[PDB]
Design a protein around this nucleic acid. Structure first.
Lengths: 86, 207, 102, 64, 124, 201
RNA sequence: UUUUUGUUUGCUAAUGUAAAAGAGAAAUUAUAUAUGUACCGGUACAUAAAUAAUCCUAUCAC
RNA sequence: UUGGAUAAGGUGCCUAAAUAUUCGCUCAUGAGAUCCCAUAAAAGGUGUUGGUUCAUAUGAACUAGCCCUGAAAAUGGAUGGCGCUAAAGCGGAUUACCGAUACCAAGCCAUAAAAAGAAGAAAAAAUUUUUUUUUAGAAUCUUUUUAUGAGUAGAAAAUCGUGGGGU
RNA sequence: UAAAUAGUACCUGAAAUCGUUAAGAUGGAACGGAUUAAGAGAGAAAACAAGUAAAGAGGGGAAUAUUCUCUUCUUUAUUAAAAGAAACAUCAGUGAUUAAUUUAAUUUCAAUAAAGCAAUCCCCUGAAAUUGUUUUCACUUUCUCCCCGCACUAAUGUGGGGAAAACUGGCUUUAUUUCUUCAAUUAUUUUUUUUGCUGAGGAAUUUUAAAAUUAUUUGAAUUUUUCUUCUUAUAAUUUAAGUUGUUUCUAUACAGUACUUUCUUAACCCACUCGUCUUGAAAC
């Protein structure tokens, strides 16, 4: 068959729906997701972060332990240098 | 009549088809496989009550007032013939820069908005078009200069379609004369032309 | 006074150049007061070149060449213009009009 | 087509067929440009050739 | 520069001239492919009498047809019979070795046949 | 760039950067004139500049000095030759660019009554650290054989007297016009007075 | 030197722009400070410190 | 051929693009400015910047960046020139840019391969009837798809002409 | 004499070369390649006009030397349509852009207005008693105050020696985030603002199918409803199935200043005398 203008399979809605049979379903779900109100997030912004306090404590602890190990390494190297001085 | 691809809602318009091409094997087919085309639509800040500047016609720089859409994208304008002395001019959006002033924000101008709107729907593109036989009669005299320039003017005056629009413009001017005239600053704003002064800068100046 | 302009002046420079490598396809245009690319992009519009002739050409002494400003060039607010015909290099330094319409 | 998408993004049963079927991608030059064709990426000096792991997607987004 | 007129799209003008045919009379303007060794043109230096190649050939869908959108065809004495059917596709030119009487009869027949003629006013 | 001509005062400017700006203006079909070339400044020590110009004088074509590279001594022609060497003068466009430039040592007459412009990309204070040695080109010219400096200085002071007279007279005029404007501001309607006062005009 | 019509046998009227579209803008001077005012480079006081990021100047006929 | 975006390389002018940002060093009375590439050393410097080791903000000893000496050749001479010091020098970091007959998208040519082939009405203009254009079937061909496209010695094919000769 | 531009160098009479006239150019080479622009020549076969009525000249053939036909040019009026180009719009591809965007992840925070903690102490950090565990002191704001210099400053203040709480700052509580931030980066989606260039082909048994859109109807569904999805059946639209339409101009003319083209001049960029043997050619 003759070659026609190859439709852009990334923006042309008709040809994209032909290629992927579920694209209109996926886009409708995306529209439904995006079409929500803002009060829900306005009142759940804390609720989704205060329940991150346990992870925040854990992260503080782990990075604290990392820096503690680094500081101990610094102190040990300093002591070895003092010994090797004399 | 429209199609809502991705929620654009573009609206459709009937379209004719006249291009003729000899087809591959035997005959000649009409080129336009389609019959409908999305309308033109306009810039966000073009409305009936706005005031604008014509940019290219032989009325260069004159200020004018939007009137009405003509179902063709091309829009009709009235720089009232008794205030700015400008006839009807079915001109385009991208030839017609529009300012940010709406004429109906004025307290005494807002009263004639109803009549201005009711006086618009009568005009149309077939009225604005030029007539074939009148064009022929005009071209006949080309095959003394003062004589020919008077002949052209009187022929266009006697043009049967012209008189309707002439009366329409006379009515618009008569309606809009006194309230606009009472504001000296607005009247001179509409009467004076627009130039470019080297002190100002186009890009950094918002319309 | 009279004879309104409603256009900006511009100067024609060389073509889309490169040392010992010509490319007479585009034209370089500099504008009145623009200085940055961010403000040079503001112009995508029509351009009229006007020049004179020693004798009449079509009943008048003036003929003109049209074109469109395509895309900004470089960082200092210089633009590339594409015309129906190549500008003859006799034009460098003359004034050209960038019209507000479109 | 989404079958190909999955069969590629996850190392599944079918490669010697899909990759043999799929012509080599022709890529446009970058939107901004490379850093240095002549130096490695992992070198402290700016450079490009080598192993980019997770970063290749950014440069593909201008390759397209 | 390529010249565009209607549907016929021509890619080149300025029929090519032989290299060095400027400062040497004995070299005629007719083109040839210089063989040489260090002969410049073969090396394709930057901007010096570029040579013809296959790429300049126009499209066969429109190749031989004349600005009249119509292939030309020569006639000599009375050979108009094969022209009756394809009058929309072939224009006719009188051969230069035709006398006035024969050319007059040919022009008479062709004008009523409604087929254009190129050199209508030849030798008259 | 967009005027019929420019006139450039050369107070405290650097030769190289000034030449760059001048040549770039010239190549785009714009007429430029430079004044008071005796005040051109050069970054470096006076003796270093003297040494370089000494070597330049040493240089001469042996076959015939008539065809020799014209050394010149006038500061105006020094700047002119620098711009010529810095501009593509061997072509027709370059020749036009070169001959669209006019310069005169000190002030001439038809240029003292036009606004002078100063190019902020070549001012010595801006583009030089204050602790590093610089020069005055007029002294260099005198050393290399100008012998026309004190005359230029006397002409300069003679012009300066008249300049002060004119400036004081025009200051008087401008201060009178400002009073006239401020006093006449209140005879206009309140709408126009508010229109002026809103934008400070 | 002023006005109008033009420059659309080798000849016997006769035309060309490297750049009109407000082509507007006269203090000098020092940069780790200046300029004006009244006195004798110094004394005292104002002016200047994003300077053109400004000001002036155009449409109102007849 | 038409547009887009790049490579190396450059962004003071010549010369298309940054007097771009930002971080330090450099005063040269023969500064310095890209590999091939168009020379510079042993030794020094109480020039200046930063360090290390020791001694009670000081004394010494080292250490490495730039710079100075060492450093002299004949037509007048070259970082390419101009010139460049709050660099347009040095060594980075940063974005933005300009930059190809390379790359990408599209069009056309030719070659090679590939898929396939040994008989019917369309439209327009006048006013249902006339006119206006076609109604195609050539196998070393016709339609269509893709890819590629450099060349001396060298070989082959299709070709275009010249003196004649049958047809 | 047909020709004398066939006049005894006598059929034609090119080139190197030279002469005349005209036009143009001319600053140490000239000529050129590619792109033009101006001039000077030419040019109607697409560069608008088929037919329709009349009359002037011609012509033909069929009908049975008279009817009818087809007519081709000059004029008259009588009207088309189409072709190209420009402008606008639309679409598709193709980019450049100018404002963003749901939901997650990564020690982010920052405020708001009501309490408290702590005084060289606090969230941090710094120095000392087979690895983890614990401890000590030493850490900040000042427009607070004292003593010495008592005016010593770069200072509308100040050096040194000492006092002070705690507005500054830090931490633990409650309610809010639009008074104020919700950063930056990655994963998964979503649009948007201004516009440049291109428009190949023309589908008598795939320009069809479905693909989507609208408007019905069918049953159901779920993220839970105005772009929510999956078809039962219907009719068209096109985002499907490579650019189509509108208005002008050419232009109401038969050669022109317009239009296409040749030539000569200039203009920005580039370009070293060819052929040859040669590793190496423009070569001194």
């Amino acid at each position: 068959k003759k070659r026609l203008q190859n439709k852009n399979s990334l923006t042309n809605f008709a040809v994209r729906c032909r290629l992927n049979p579920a694209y209109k379903l996926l886009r409708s779900l995306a529209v439904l997701r995006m079409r929500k109100s803002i009060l829900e997030k306005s009142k759940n912004k804390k609720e989704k972060r205060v329940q991150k306090q346990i992870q925040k404590k854990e992260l503080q602890k782990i990075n604290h332990d990392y820096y503690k190990g680094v500081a101990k390494a610094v102190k040990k190297k300093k002591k070895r240098e003092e010994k090797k001085a004399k | 009549k429209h199609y809502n691809v991705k929620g654009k809602k573009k609206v459709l318009v009937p379209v004719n088809a006249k291009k003729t091409i000899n087809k591959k094997y035997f005959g000649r087919k009409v080129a336009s496989k389609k019959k409908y085309v999305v309308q033109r639509k306009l810039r966000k800040s073009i409305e009936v009550g706005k005031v604008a500047i014509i940019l290219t016609g032989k009325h260069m720089g004159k200020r004018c007032i939007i009137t009405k859409i003509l179902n063709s994208g091309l829009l009709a304008v009235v720089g009232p013939y008794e205030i700015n002395g400008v006839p009807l001019k079915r001109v385009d959006s991208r030839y017609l820069v529009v300012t940010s002033t709406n004429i109906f924000n004025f307290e005494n101008i807002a009263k004639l908005k109803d009549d201005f709107l009711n006086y618009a729907q009568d005009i149309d593109d077939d009225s604005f078009i030029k007539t074939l036989e009148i064009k022929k009669k005009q071209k006949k005299l080309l095959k003394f200069m003062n004589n020919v320039i008077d002949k052209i003017k009187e022929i266009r005056k006697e043009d049967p379609k012209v008189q309707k629009l002439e009366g329409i413009q006379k009515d618009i001017g008569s309606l809009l004369k006194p309230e606009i005239l009472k504001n000296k600053v607005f009247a001179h704003y509409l009467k004076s032309k627009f130039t470019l002064r080297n002190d100002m800068v186009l890009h950094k100046m918002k319309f | 006074l009279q004879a309104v302009r409603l256009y900006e002046k511009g100067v024609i420079l060389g073509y889309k150049r490169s040392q010992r490598n010509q490319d007479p396809n585009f034209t370089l245009i500099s504008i009145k007061n623009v200085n940055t690319k961010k403000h040079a992009q503001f112009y995508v519009k029509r351009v009229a070149y006007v020049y004179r002739t020693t004798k009449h050409h079509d009943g008048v002494k003036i003929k003109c060449i049209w074109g469109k400003v395509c895309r900004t060039h470089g960082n200092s607010g210089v633009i590339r213009a594409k015309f129906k015909t190549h500008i003859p290099p006799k034009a460098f330094g003359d004034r050209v009009r960038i019209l507000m319409y479109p | 087509i989404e079958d190909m998408v999955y069969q590629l993004y996850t190392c599944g049963p079918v490669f010697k067929k899909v990759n043999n079927f799929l012509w080599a991608f022709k890529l446009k030059p970058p939107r901004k440009g490379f850093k240095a064709k002549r130096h490695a990426f992992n070198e402290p000096r700016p450079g490009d050739w080598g192993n980019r792991e997770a970063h290749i997607n950014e440069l593909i987004n201008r390759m397209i | 520069a390529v010249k565009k007129v209607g549907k016929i799209i021509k890619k080149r003008t300025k029929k090519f001239t032989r290299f060095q045919s400027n400062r040497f009379m004995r070299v005629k303007p007719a083109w040839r492919k210089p063989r040489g060794i260090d002969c410049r043109v073969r090396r394709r230096y930057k901007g010096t009498n570029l040579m013809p190649s296959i790429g300049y050939g126009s499209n066969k869908k429109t190749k031989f047809l004349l600005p009249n959108n119509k292939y030309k065809y020569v006639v000599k004495n009375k050979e108009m019979e094969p022209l009756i059917m394809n009058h929309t596709k072939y224009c006719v030119q009188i051969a230069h070795n035709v006398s006035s009487k024969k050319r007059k009869q040919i022009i008479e027949r062709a004008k009523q046949m409604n087929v254009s003629v190129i050199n209508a006013k030849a030798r008259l | 760039m967009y005027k019929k001509e420019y006139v450039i005062d050369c107070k405290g400017h650097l030769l190289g950067r000034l030449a760059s700006l001048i040549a770039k203006e010239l190549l785009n079909g714009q007429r430029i004139v430079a004044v008071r070339c005796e005040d051109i400044n050069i970054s470096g020590s006076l003796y270093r500049n003297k040494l370089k110009y000494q070597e330049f004088l040493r240089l001469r074509t042996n076959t015939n000095p008539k065809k020799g590279p014209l050394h010149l001594r006038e500061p105006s022609k020094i700047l002119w030759r620098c711009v010529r060497g810095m501009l593509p003068h061997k072509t027709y466009k370059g020749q036009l660019a070169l001959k669209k430039l006019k310069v005169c040592v000190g002030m001439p007459y038809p240029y003292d009554k036009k606004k002078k412009y100063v190019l902020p990309s070549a001012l010595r204070a801006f583009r030089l650290k204050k602790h590093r040695r610089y020069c005055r080109l007029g002294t260099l010219s005198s050393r290399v054989g100008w012998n026309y400096d004190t005359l230029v200085k006397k002409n300069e002071v003679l012009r300066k007297q008249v300049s002060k007279a004119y400036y004081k007279k025009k200051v008087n005029n401008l201060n009178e016009k400002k009073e006239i404007k401020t006093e006449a501001l209140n005879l206009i309607n309140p709408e126009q007075r508010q229109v002026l006062e809103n934008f400070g005009y």
